[PDB]
């Protein structure tokens, strides 16, 4: 999917898939592939330190007749990624009800031993993970597609800042006339 519009689509569907986790990823805004080339990520890569809360907006793109509730969870570090909805709901989470408001915001509050984390994150400055689960499956009437996509947007909250300027790993050259 590295060069196709799919990389941006989170697949979700009608029928019984509760045991099936929808997605999950580490919270390393400047380092993990999921975030590094994001607007927030590209910026973090010109610095060595970051701090702040992050907003993850999820937008449902199925038909208007589609329905459903999801559980969006964020787990601070210290344990491995929740492996079931039971485990995930013990952490920070919102239960999102698909409706006229197509989008839902999971805000990742800043919880850390230190005031700052390395953009080049290590285990010492771990930030945890966010995982998503069907809270109550996707139901749909006849004549409508039984599977759709959910998109995810990221952005910094107003308590966010960065420090210690450095060059980006992302750009380079072998010779002049660049």
């Amino acid at each position: 999917n590295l060069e196709t519009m799919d990389i941006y689509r989170i697949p979700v569907q009608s029928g019984n898939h509760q045991s099936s986790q929808v997605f999950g990823f580490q919270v390393q805004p400047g380092l993990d592939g999921v975030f590094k080339h994001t607007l927030l990520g590209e910026i973090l890569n010109y610095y060595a330190h970051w701090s702040g809360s992050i907003k993850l907006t999820f937008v449902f793109c199925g038909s208007a007749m589609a329905t459903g509730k999801f559980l969006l969870a964020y787990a601070p570090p210290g344990a491995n990624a929740p492996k079931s909805r039971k485990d995930a709901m013990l952490g920070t989470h919102i239960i999102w009800d698909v409706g006229l408001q197509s989008s839902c915001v999971l805000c990742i509050p800043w919880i850390s031993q230190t005031h700052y984390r390395l953009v080049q994150q290590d285990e010492y400055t771990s930030a945890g993970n966010v995982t998503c689960w069907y809270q109550t499956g996707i139901v749909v009437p006849a004549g409508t597609p039984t599977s759709c996509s959910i998109m995810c947007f990221v952005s910094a909250c107003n308590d966010f800042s960065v420090r210690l300027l450095k060059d980006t790993p992302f750009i380079q050259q072998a010779a002049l006339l660049q």
């Binding site: 590295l2 915001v105 800043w110 107003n158 800042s161």
Partner: protein, 289 residues
Amino acid sequence: GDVVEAVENAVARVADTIGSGPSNSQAVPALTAVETGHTSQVTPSDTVQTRHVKNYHSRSESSIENFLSRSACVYMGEYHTTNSDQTKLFASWTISARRMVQMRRKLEIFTYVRFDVEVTFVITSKQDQGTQLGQDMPPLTHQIMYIPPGGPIPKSVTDYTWQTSTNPSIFWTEGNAPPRMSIPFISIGNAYSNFYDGWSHFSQNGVYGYNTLNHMGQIYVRHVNGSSPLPMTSTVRMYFKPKHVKAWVPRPPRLCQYKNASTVNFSPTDITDKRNSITYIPDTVKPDV
């Protein structure tokens, strides 16, 4: 305020975390409509119970001035003390920040920029390799000359043109501090333009892009002692530190590598790195697997 002044107070504090308790209402801050093109203004206190935190963190180092205002190499070239080529006796290029990527990607984050520039030159010389190496050459003195578009161009290290009755020049001798000077905002327009989705000719042809807008002249640099029994060669490195900056209409950071200096050309490149599955999160916290 006035973006030309070297002093101006005020701390750039981020927001405090407002203390938040339990809620049962019709307020639904966590539910928005991304279609409007608006970015949600939700903070932790809107979705979880938060304590109060007096936050002192400042955004000082991410101000446009502090982000761009660090000298960056934008060019490097060589010239010889002695050679049969005449041409190889002096260096020359056309001013632009498009030949070294680091600086270029930084500027290209903005569509337009306006600023003064602090130029610093680092010049070094080495004695060329050869069978006989003994000589006693006095200190080398160089001449850097700026030729605004339209000025006569040097054709040899001894051309009358180096008289600089009017072009600005810098004479510097090795061993001293690197030469330096400020240049004002020199554009014909109201802001330097980093991108130009346009042409040079009115008939929608000619040259496309950044180049048609450039034309800031060129630099020529030569040795002044002019000689050395045995061959030597110098390298001139030029650094740009923009200062007193203003920037408009930000754009995404260049993702694909640059292919050349005159174009925005690129090869298709990956959106990001792959990972195993859409649920893959590595297991840290194990008695080491």
